Each structure stands twice: as C-alpha cells, then as structure tokens.
Amino acid sequence: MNIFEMLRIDEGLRLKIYKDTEGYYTIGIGHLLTKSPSLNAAKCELDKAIGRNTNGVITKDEAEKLFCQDVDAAVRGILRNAKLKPVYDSLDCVRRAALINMVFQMGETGVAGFCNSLRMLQQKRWDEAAVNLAKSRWYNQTPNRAKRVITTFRTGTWDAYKNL
Ligand code: NA
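Above: the input record for the complex with sodium ion. Below: its predicted structure, written as tokens.
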C-alpha cells in the first residue's frame, strides 16, 4: 500500500464530471474543479487543467496526471504551513500518508486548524489523537473514510486499506 493507492481507494476514479460528497464539481481521482454551482465554470476549469477541449470527459491517464499533481500539491501545502510541517516531520512514512490524505480531502487550512489533534499526533499519543480526530465534521460527514485514515494514525499500519 502507498499514498497513491490509498487515495485511489478513498477518492475513486470517474472519467466524467461528477459532484463530490459536498456537492462540488469534480473529476478523476477526487480532482475538485470548482465550488461554483455553474457546470459551465467547471467545464472551463477542466479544459484549462487538461489543456484541451474535453467536453467534460477525460481519460484514465489524464485523471492519473491530475492526481500526480494533486498529491504533490497536498505535500507542498503541508511543507509550507507552519502548523502542519512540524507534525509531518515528526511522523513515520505511513502516518505521513494519513496526513497527506486529510490535506488532499479538506485542504491545508482546514487541517492546520485542528490544534488539539495535531498536538496529540506530534506527541505520539495515538489513541488520544484518534479519539480527538473523530470529534469533527469530517468524521461525521465521511465516517467510513475518516475511520480508515484515523486507524492509519492510530496504528501506523495500512491495516484499514487491506480488503480494498
Ligand atoms: Na465515508
């Protein structure tokens, strides 16, 4: 298991524009296009992102290319955020993937505001961090995904991604 496979499980793969769990136009492996309610706006974002007139449909290779960029962007956002970087640097490679996963889903600013969970992770108080992470809109709105990510933080293993 690795970060690409883990996010592929959590995000799925769809080749036509769809609405994510929050109702926002998305494509590929969880590539958010826009928060605008305008499908036309989403279509401009998509054509700009891919570099051609897509008419709302992309190939698997194109989806994987956006995904490569989006994983990089999540790592970069962690490294450039003064609250996230020390936590990331303190973590092992598997738990780093759990943090990248959170940032991919909700953005650097949102994750960076969880000062109690971040402190517990930095302190390596894994059970306490796991309990604290579940007291979130994130957990309530996407509980099965959040449970997998939380198990990854709690155990430092990929066990939650094994039957998928
Ligand atoms: Na879920």
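Notes for the reader.
The radius of gyration is 16 Å.
Residues 142-145 surround sodium ion (CB under 6 Å).
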